[PDB]
Amino acid sequence: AGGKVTSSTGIAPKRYVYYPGSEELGPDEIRVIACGTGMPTARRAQAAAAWVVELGNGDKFIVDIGSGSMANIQSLMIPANYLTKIFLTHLHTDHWGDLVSMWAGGWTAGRTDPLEVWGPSGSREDMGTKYAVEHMLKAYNWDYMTRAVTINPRPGDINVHEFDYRALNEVVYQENGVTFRSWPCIHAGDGPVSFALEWNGYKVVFGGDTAPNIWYPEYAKGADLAIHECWMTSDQMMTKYNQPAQLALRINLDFHTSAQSFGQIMNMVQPRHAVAYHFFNDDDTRYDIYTGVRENYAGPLSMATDMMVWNITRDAVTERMAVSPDHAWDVAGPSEDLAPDRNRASEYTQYILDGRLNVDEANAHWKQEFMG
């Protein structure tokens, strides 16, 4: 498997696994990493929905950042300054729960710029992305204020770009040769969208969540990589959640995209490569889902799980697994020492600072060796 090894002390070429941080990205290349593929029910094997897109022109994007996904993002060895642009398909916790963790961790770990967040509006102000992030920053005000005591607050801001969720395939970002368009999803209530990323002859579609709709098959047509929700079977709903049959059947027809519907949809789209996600990917669930899909779609398919990676180039769309460090660490970026705002008042009161314990004797031994 992998490229032929030509040499005893050299590097193995075209490796059968993707080791994050080991492979340069070609100027006509895209890398997409599934940093979460699961559900609002949490699990070590699957973080909630998250995707990292890396373009050969050096731009990077996170599309969705659900609960748990930061552990996988952080295993990528990408500096925090290269991941400042996040697109949200919808405001479910399994699609933006870890925004706070990228916000606070990336700032404790030297992001110098503010985060930038694109997400949809709702039917009214309290149902949209601008309200959502504004209240998230208030929810975390203690964190924000205490950390801004010692770190310039500028990376602590979130610049929100809200767009009309009703818009049919309209441009929502246009920068440095890169476009995103959105269209609507049919999912729990008005607001949710899917995205298409256009750059340099490629199209990458992030379906978010939806029941099957008329918009996706139209605006996703001919994508290099087409991502779409694909649900657990009605039999699995009966077995895993003890649903009675009526309600089990309806989940796969009214509320979600069935495996058989996902097949219908990607048959219409004819992408280079289709990606099914948002099911629990276990030894007793996956096979009936892949069969549901094969009933109607025959093209190349990935059955997504965490740390699956796609390399998009002119000749091929290639699926591999990323082999990344469980014991992850922050990895430094180029950026320069950004200064705290020393007008910032302390958030301690003297009542608390009065309780400091004297540990001089306990610490003298290691201090003296370390200062030596």
Count of C-beta atoms within a 10 Å radius of residue 314: 10
The entry of Zn ion, a second copy, none near residue 264 (CB within 5 to 8 angstroms by kind) is a second copy
- With CB under 5 A as the contact rule, the residue among 94, 98, 224, 306 that binds Zn ion is 94
The entry of Zn ion, a second copy, none near residue 209 (CB within 5 to 8 angstroms by kind) is Zn ion
Helix axes 129-139, 141-148, angle to 10 degrees: 60
| Residues from 301 through 360 that contact Zn ion (CB under 5 A) | none
Helix axes 141-148, 99-108, angle to 10 degrees: 10
The entry of a second copy, Zn ion, none near residue 28 (CB within 5 to 8 angstroms by kind) is none
Residue 88: CB minimum distance to a second copy, A: 10
Q: Which is nearer to a second copy, 26 or 177 (CB)?
A: 26
Q: Which stretch binds a second copy (CB under 8 A): 155-163, 173-181, 199-207, 329-337?
A: 329-337
**What is the DSSP code (8-state) at residue 285?**
T
Residues 6+ apart with CB under 8 A from 202: 30, 224, 312
Give how far the C-alpha of residue 299 lies from the chain's centroid of Cα atoms, to the nearest Å.
25
- With CB under 5 A as the contact rule, the residue among 31, 60, 85, 92 that binds Zn ion is 92
Using the rule CB under 8 A, is 153 a contact of a second copy? no
| Residues from 194 through 223 that contact a second copy (CB under 8 A) | 211-217
Using the rule CB under 8 A, is 311 a contact of a second copy? no
Helix axes 99-108, 129-139, angle to 10 degrees: 50
Using the rule CB under 8 A, is 158 a contact of a second copy? no
DSSP 173-210: EEETTEEEEEEE-BSSSS--EEEEEEETTEEEEE--S-
Residue 366: CB minimum distance to Zn ion, A: 23
Using the rule CB under 8 A, is 232 a contact of a second copy? no
Using the rule CB under 5 A, is 209 a contact of Zn ion? yes
Using the rule CB under 8 A, is 145 a contact of a second copy? yes
- In angstroms, the CA 277 to CA 209 distance is 10
Only one residue has tokens 């004297």, namely: 358
| Residues from 234 through 253 that contact a second copy (CB under 8 A) | 234-235, 239-242, 245, 248-249, 252-253
Using the rule CB under 8 A, is 282 a contact of a second copy? yes
| Residues from 59 through 118 that contact a second copy (CB under 8 A) | 59-60, 67-68, 70-75, 77-79, 82, 90-94, 97-98, 100-101, 103-105, 108-109
Q: Are 341 and 148 in contact (CB under 8 A)?
A: yes
- In angstroms, the CA 60 to CA 315 distance is 22
- In angstroms, the CA 260 to CA 240 distance is 20
Residue 49: CB minimum distance to Zn ion, A: 6
Tokens at 255, concatenated: 């509320």
Q: Applying CB under 5 A, which residues contact Zn ion?
A: 92, 94, 209
